[PDB]
């Protein structure tokens, strides 16, 4: 009903999850959400600072292509600078 917040608490997890690893010192979950759409759907993007991010998608489907199709890419950042990041499943 009424709107909330925003929080990573340890939830389950379904059989659409992923983390995504090698993240550069300077991302965001906006700069993931706007990347990961490469392998299906991605209706949850969130990170920390950095080192990862953390990240639900739509369908098992859709999760175990972004490890065959997403994965090994590169990664962009609001710094000027890329770094590559390697997909797996939850």
Known sequence: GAPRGRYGPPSRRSENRVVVSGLPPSGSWQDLKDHMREAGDVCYADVYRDGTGV??????????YAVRKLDNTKFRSHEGETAYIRVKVD
């Open 55 to 64: 990240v639900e998608f739509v369908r098992k489907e859709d999760m175990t």
